[PDB]
Amino acid sequence: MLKKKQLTVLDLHPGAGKTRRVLPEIVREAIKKRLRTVILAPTRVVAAEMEEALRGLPVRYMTTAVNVTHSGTEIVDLMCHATFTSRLLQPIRVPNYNLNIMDEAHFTDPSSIAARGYISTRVEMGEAAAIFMTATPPGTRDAFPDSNSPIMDTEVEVPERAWSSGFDWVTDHSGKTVWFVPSVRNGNEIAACLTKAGKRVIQLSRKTFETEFQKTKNQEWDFVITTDISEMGANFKADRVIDSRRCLKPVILDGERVILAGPMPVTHASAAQRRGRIGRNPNKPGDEYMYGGGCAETDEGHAHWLEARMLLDNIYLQDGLIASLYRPEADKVAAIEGEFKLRTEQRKTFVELMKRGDLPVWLAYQVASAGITYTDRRWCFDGTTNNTIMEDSVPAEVWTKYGEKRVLKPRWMDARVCSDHAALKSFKEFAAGKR
Numbered sequence: 001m002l003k004k005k006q007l008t009v010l011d012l013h014p015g016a017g018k019t020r021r022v023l024p025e026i027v028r029e030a031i032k033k034r035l036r037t038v039i040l041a042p043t044r045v046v047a048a049e050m051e052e053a054l055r056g057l058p059v060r061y062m063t064t065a066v067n068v069t070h071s072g073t074e075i076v077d078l079m080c081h082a083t084f085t086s087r088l089l090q091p092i093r094v095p096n097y098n099l100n101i102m103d104e105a106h107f108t109d110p111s112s113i114a115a116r117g118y119i120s121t122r123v124e125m126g127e128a129a130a131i132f133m134t135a136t137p138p139g140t141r142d143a144f145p146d147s148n149s150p151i152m153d154t155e156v157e158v159p160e161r162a163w164s165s166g167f168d169w170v171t172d173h174s175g176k177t178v179w180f181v182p183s184v185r186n187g188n189e190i191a192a193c194l195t196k197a198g199k200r201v202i203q204l205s206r207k208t209f210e211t212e213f214q215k216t217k218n219q220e221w222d223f224v225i226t227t228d229i230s231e232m233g234a235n236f237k238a239d240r241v242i243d244s245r246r247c248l249k250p251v252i253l254d255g256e257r258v259i260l261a262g263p264m265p266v267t268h269a270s271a272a273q274r275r276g277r278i279g280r281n282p283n284k285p286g287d288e289y290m291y292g293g294g295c296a297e298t299d300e301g302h303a304h305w306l307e308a309r310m311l312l313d314n315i316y317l318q319d320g321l322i323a324s325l326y327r328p329e330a331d332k333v334a335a336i337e338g339e340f341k342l343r344t345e346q347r348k349t350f351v352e353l354m355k356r357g358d359l360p361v362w363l364a365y366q367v368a369s370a371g372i373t374y375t376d377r378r379w380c381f382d383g384t385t386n387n388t389i390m391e392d393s394v395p396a397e398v399w400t401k402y403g404e405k406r407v408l409k410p411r412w413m414d415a416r417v418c419s420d421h422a423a424l425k426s427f428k429e430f431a432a433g434k435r
């Protein structure tokens with residue numbers, strides 16, 4: 001696998017031991033051959049699991065998720081997918097890694113797509129080797145891959161709202177259930193309904209993931225209610241998955257706003273990863289997978305692929321050359337390489353709106369490309385009346401940095417800045433000049 005000019009897709013089934021058995025073997029071989037190597041973890045949780053699998057090997061952990069004293073003699077670096085892309089965008093030297101290893105390489109967050117595009121472009125150039133580790137590479141059509149033990153697959157109507165009757169099979173279960181919901185808000189309603197029925201419920205989402213995931217290890221629980229983030233190598237001691245088979249899809253309308261469309265069907269890859277949370281123990285056959293809809297290729301026209309092009313347009317490769325998306329995912333967006341390339345000062349604004357601002361890529365781009373500077377928040381208040389952000393059926397209000405109470409009315413509306421209470425709170429703080 002380790003010869004230059006090669007990209008290898010390690011597509012062993014979920015639970016086959018890619019992370020705990022194959023990855024340490026690859027790393028040992030890489031060190032033997034003096035390959036400067038990066039290992040990309042999708043999350044801080046997986047980064048910590050990798051440290052356990054790699055413990056004893058000279059690996060530099062570029063994450064505060066691991067508390068290790070580095071020797072200074074490591075040629076293998078480990079960081080999150082997002083950290084890799086972030087360091088590429090920033091005015092900081094990223095080594096030209098000979099070997100690029102991406103774990104959970106199916107991750108469809110913009111920074112992961114961008115990292116695959118950059119890595120696969122370096123391999124196509126003949127400059128590097130890469131290994132993408134995933135049961136479900138782009139365009140996979142099999143929602144029902146092999147497992148370590150037989151799974152009971154049942155198509156069933158799954159609740160997406162509180163219920164009083166008609167779903168006894170949900171609560172009548174005495175094991176542990178991982179339940180994939182399309183959104184935080186939908187999970188909150190299911191979680192309240194299960195809590196009222198006497199169940200112990202943990203909720204996971206992107207913003208709460210590291211903190212709340214620890215509860216699945218430290219306390220007894222009956223249900224984990226999770227968004228799609230648990231597709232990215234989160235492991236549970238569970239005997240059932242309940243899968244809505246639904247997700248939200250960010251969509252750019254008319255080049256001018258972003259909506260969260262759906263809920264709508266998940267991809268085959270997502271369905272296989274959700275299912276793949278169970279059937280992992282060869283000694284425990286008959287884990288159950290209850291699924292509430294079909295799959296569709298809802299990654300086509302999804303904003304994350306256009307966002308990935310915005311990031312790649314702003315990463316230096318060589319002179320004016322721009323990295324392509326990884327070929328199997330390159331048709332998910334109608335975009336021209338270079339269309340989003342910013343001049344030096346606008347690019348810095350774009351980076352800071354994402355890194356410090358915590359704005360979605362698309363929104364960061366609109367503000368930066370309009371020639372607005374990072375601390376200038378006038379745009380949060382001067383949109384049309386129909387861009388008014390609503391909080392519990394009333395216009396959201398903040399005190400501006402000037403001490404004026406104003407209605408939150410952004411010039412560009414991205415539904416992700418108000419998708420749940422936590423998002424809207426963060427965006428209000430941003431509009432107020434608090435970061």
Ligand SMILES: COCC(=O)Nc1nc(-c2ccccc2)cs1
Nearest residue numbers: 261262263264265293294295296
């Ligand atoms: C599952 O097999 C049928 C199918 O693919 N149905 C879909 N429904 C959508 C959809 C749903 C909500 C909002 C917009 C679009 C996309 S695909």
